[PDB]
Design a protein around this ligand. Structure first.
Ligand SMILES: [Mg+2]
Lengths: 132, 86, 101, 77, 118, 113, 195, 133
């Protein structure tokens, strides 16, 4: 009996997402990686910094877009340029959405001394894979 | 052989290393001054970015009122409860 | 706002070792050299002995960054085994697969 | 209008001037067949932004192309 | 005897100018500054104005935070040092009439100039 | 000059307009230079002030104030060898190393044994 | 309260410039993409997740951009600028005759904010001595001096340069080293004559 | 209907210095997704053959590194967990390639990278002999 990044089977009243449902040993078999960089590859370096500041990015953006997201993020770092992809709901106003978009993008760029971009996908209700 | 000894001398003069003979305790000097010590290597200098910076920024931004930090919310809620209950 | 006072001490040790890195190597070479005078070797010996504490790179420890666990930490990622397993299961990091070979 | 239409598109600038320009442009194009006009329009509607639609409606009326007005109203809505 | 093609020199932006001139403007698509999803899709002139103005206001907020707390972003982690990304310094130095006068044209205000004339 | 700079900046503010292409965004990023410079030489900048390989390696000019026989000569030859072998630090740091060694054995010149 | 307009699927026509609507690399944006492509493990009596909430499609790298049409267009565009290789240089023996001295550097490219990496400094070079020295004493002297930098099976001498951090410094040092090596192999000594 | 009249072409200058002659552009792309690498190398070879240069393809072996961590926290030594980083190589070699062609091609490819990939360039160019020799 192992407990690792997996949801307990309940009576059947727990909507779950794809990755939130599937186990951590199918990350390559039936899932994709949340992040894509080369520090893990051989010969590269600074992978520790990559991971640490990626965790920081995830936490900061999760807490500066609270209650709107419904899934984990997608990182995409091509050379210099950084890209983040998110999914959110449409309860708040596009005014606030764009204001926070610009604010967060500027903060990330000024902090990392790096060109950054961020995209969001709107949803009326978070997509559920199964009822667990 | 003296011929090979002088060949090595010439090769050392050409490629930079010492022509004169030298012990291992003496080549310690050259290899130390070639290789950088861990004391100044970046792997030791920057073991991680500063929680000073991180926590100060996040606290200041909380005070701005943009990052709803659930963790400190729970913490100071329990703190209010404790100071109410004595 | 480091995790704990032991992390604080380790970071101070790293600071000292860095800001006296070159000089320590210089005098250590002056000590371990062989042909120079033994009196000079001893001079450099008491010099290193009088150098302050927390200045050597031997007292430092490659501790963890987040949970500050000294053991079970990989040099490359700098993370503890526990946090590494956590992120590997949650798929946070990139291009790591379970070795079901 | 076609004559007035390299990197000389920077001189538009403010949204107010861009609005006036596009409004008068589409108005002249409507009050000029109108198949090419509606082609240009259905091409630039997402990029582009009441009076213009009124001119469009009267142009479609004089054209007698009844089948087109529904889609235009649906796009405006 | 031997033929050799001659060398040429390009601007870093010229290649991308070529790549851009290669492709025409996107058809039936809002400006690139605006997002792509339909909910955030600005569907009117006034609301689009307000939207990109909110974005500019966020930019100004970023300027304010950086010039209020420069020490946080002081770290030059990026290998190429960029003053556009470095924090901004409108801080008068210690009392020094000559250096203060030289700094007048740097600070771009009027109270410093009144005090210096005084 | 200054008033022509005011004129130029206001002209630029008149020119600036919203882009409509990711290629235009890339053009802007390259304009400010934050976007990396292809081909990646890994050395666009950090030229070491036009230093030279012989300036790095040949320390014979920096070695003048001691004969060519003594143990100080031996040690400083080993030093210069290691310095030339090390690429990471530049001629500046090499010169500071040499100067500190000079100061060291000149303040401990009392022996010469 | 607010409601989102329907996607661009019905709006986009079958005749369409995909290289124009996707000039650069970008996310999948299913709302703009008309294709019903789905990806995901289907449940028994089920199917993969629809493109709307399909986030693993975003997880994976994206290649809708740079279609074959876009590639053809960009190649036809940039052929205006590409140059031609000399037709005289069409064989290894001919090109090594024209320019014997081979030299090659190398470096990685990786994602991240920083770009410097010390491996940029190392370079290597190669030259065959069968045609360059033009004499016997000097070549015997050179092959005696060099310890392992020679290869007589393929008959090419190869040497690396890594002592300098700068690529151009490595280059200049290698050139000067080869020059001084030739000038020092030219002459000889009495202890070398006595063997 | 909107069809631009004058397409802005960048300026170009053919300087007096002769262009450099690259002889082997041997690129080695390391990644994780074999399909991504296949698409990328197809893209590369297609662009190369449309620009009018020679090409060749071959796939070096897969390299894997695994290391064992403790499955549990406090005391369980028999029960461990394993991991593996798989790197896949793909090589592409180009011969007899002019310097400016190299410039344009490397700009194109370096802008057209995907995210989770590394790439090592090895450039071999022949040159004449010095004058001091
Ligand atoms: Mg078990």
């Amino acid at each position: 009996k192992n407990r690792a990044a997996r949801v307990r089977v309940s009576k059947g009243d727990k909507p779950v997402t794809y990755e939130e449902a599937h186990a951590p040993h199918y990350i390559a078999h039936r899932k994709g990686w949340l992040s894509l960089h080369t520090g893990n590859l051989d010969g590269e370096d600074h992978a520790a910094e990559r991971t640490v500041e990626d965790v920081f990015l995830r936490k900061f953006m999760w807490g500066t877009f609270p209650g709107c997201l419904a899934d984990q993020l997608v990182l995409k770092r091509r050379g210099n340029q950084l890209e983040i992809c998110a999914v959110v709901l449409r309860q708040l106003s596009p005014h606030k959405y764009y204001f926070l978009v610009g604010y967060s993008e500027t903060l990330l760029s000024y902090f990392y001394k790096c060109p950054v971009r961020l995209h969001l996908q709107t949803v009326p209700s978070k997509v559920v894979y199964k009822y667990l | 052989s003296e011929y090979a000894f002088r060949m090595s001398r010439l090769s050392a003069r050409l490629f930079g290393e010492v022509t004169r003979p030298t012990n291992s305790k003496s080549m310690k000097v050259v290899k130390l001054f070639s290789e950088l010590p861990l004391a100044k290597k970046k792997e030791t200098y920057d073991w991680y970015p500063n929680h000073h910076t991180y926590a100060e920024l996040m606290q200041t931004l909380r005070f701005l009122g943009l990052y709803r930090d659930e963790h400190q919310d729970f913490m100071d809620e329990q703190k209010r409860l404790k100071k109410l209950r004595g | 706002h480091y995790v704990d006072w032991r992390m604080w001490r380790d970071v101070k040790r790293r600071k000292m070792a860095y800001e006296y890195a070159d000089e320590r190597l210089r005098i250590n070479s002056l000590r371990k050299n062989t042909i120079l005078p033994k009196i000079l070797q001893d001079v450099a010996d008491e010099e290193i002995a009088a150098l302050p504490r927390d200045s050597c790179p031997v007292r430092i420890r490659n501790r963890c960054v987040m949970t500050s666990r000294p053991r079970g930490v990989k040099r490359r990622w700098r993370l503890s085994r526990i946090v590494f397993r956590h992120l590997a299961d949650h798929g946070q990091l990139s291009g790591i697969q379970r070795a079901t070979w | 209008a076609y004559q007035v239409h390299g990197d000389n598109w920077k001189f538009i600038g403010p949204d107010q001037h861009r609005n006036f320009y596009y409004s008068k442009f589409f108005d002249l194009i409507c009050l000029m067949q109108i198949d090419v006009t509606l082609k240009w329009y259905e091409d630039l509607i997402p990029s582009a932004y009441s009076q213009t639609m009124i001119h469009l409606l009267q142009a479609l009326d004089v054209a007698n192309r009844l089948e087109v007005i529904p889609k235009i109203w649906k796009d405006s809505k | 005897e031997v033929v050799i093609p001659k060398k040429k020199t390009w601007d870093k932006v010229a290649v991308l100018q070529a790549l851009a001139s290669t492709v025409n403007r996107d058809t039936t698509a809002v400006p690139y500054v605006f997002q792509d999803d339909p909910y955030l899709m600005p569907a009117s002139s006034l609301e689009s104005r307000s939207f990109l103005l909110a974005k500019k206001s966020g930019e100004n907020v970023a300027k304010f935070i950086i010039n209020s707390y420069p020490k946080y972003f002081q770290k030059d982690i990026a290998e190429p040092h960029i003053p556009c990304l470095m924090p901004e310094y409108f801080e008068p130095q210690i009392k020094d009439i000559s250096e203060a006068a030289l700094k007048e044209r740097i600070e771009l205000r009027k109270v410093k100039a009144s005090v210096d004339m005084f | 000059s200054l008033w022509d700079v005011e004129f130029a900046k206001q002209l630029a503010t008149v020119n600036e307009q919203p882009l409509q292409n990711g290629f235009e965004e890339l053009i802007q990023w390259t304009k400010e230079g934050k976007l990396w410079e292809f081909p990646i030489n890994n050395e666009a900048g950090f030229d070491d002030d036009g230093s030279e390989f012989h300036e790095h390696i040949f320390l014979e000019k920096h070695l003048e104030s001691f004969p060519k026989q003594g143990p100080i000569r031996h040690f400083m030859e080993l030093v210069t060898c290691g310095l030339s072998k090390n690429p990471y630090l530049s001629v500046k740091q090499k010169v500071e190393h040499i100067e500190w060694f000079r100061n060291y054995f000149n303040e401990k010149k009392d022996i010469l044994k | 309260r607010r409601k989102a307009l329907p996607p661009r699927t019905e709006k986009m026509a079958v005749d369409q410039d995909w290289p124009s609507v996707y000039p650069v690399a970008a996310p999948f944006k299913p709302s703009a993409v008309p294709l019903p492509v789905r990806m995901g493990y289907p449940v028994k009596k089920g199917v993969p997740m629809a493109k709307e909430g399909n986030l693993e499609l975003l997880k994976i790298p994206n290649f809708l951009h740079l279609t074959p049409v876009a590639i053809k267009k960009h190649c036809e565009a940039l052929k205006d600028f590409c140059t031609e290789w000399p037709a005289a240089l069409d064989s290894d023996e001919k090109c090594e005759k024209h320019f014997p001295i081979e030299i090659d550097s190398t470096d990685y490219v990786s994602s991240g904010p920083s770009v410097r990496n010390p491996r940029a400094r190392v370079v290597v070079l190669r030259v065959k001595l069968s045609s360059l020295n033009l004499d016997d004493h000097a070549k015997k002297k050179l092959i005696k001096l060099v310890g392992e930098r020679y290869c007589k099976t393929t008959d090419v001498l190869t040497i690396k340069t890594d002592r300098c951090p700068l690529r151009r410094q490595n280059y200049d040092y290698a050139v000067y080293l080869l020059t001084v090596l030739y000038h020092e192999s030219w002459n000889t000594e009495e202890w070398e004559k006595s063997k | 209907v909107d069809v631009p009249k004058d397409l802005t072409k960048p300026v170009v200058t053919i300087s007096d210095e002769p262009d450099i002659l690259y002889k082997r552009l041997s690129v080695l792309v390391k990644g994780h997704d074999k399909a991504v690498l296949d698409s990328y190398e197809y893209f590369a070879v297609l662009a190369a053959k449309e620009l009018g240069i020679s090409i060749k393809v071959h796939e070096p072996p897969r390299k894997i590194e695994r290391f064992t961590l403790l499955q549990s926290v406090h005391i369980y030594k028999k029960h461990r967990v394993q991991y593996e980083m798989r790197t896949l190589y793909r090589c592409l070699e180009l011969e007899h390639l002019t310097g400016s062609t190299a410039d344009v091609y490397l700009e194109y490819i370096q802008r057209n990278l995907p995210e989770g990939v590394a790439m090592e360039v090895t450039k071999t160019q022949l040159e004449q002999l010095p004058e001091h020799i």
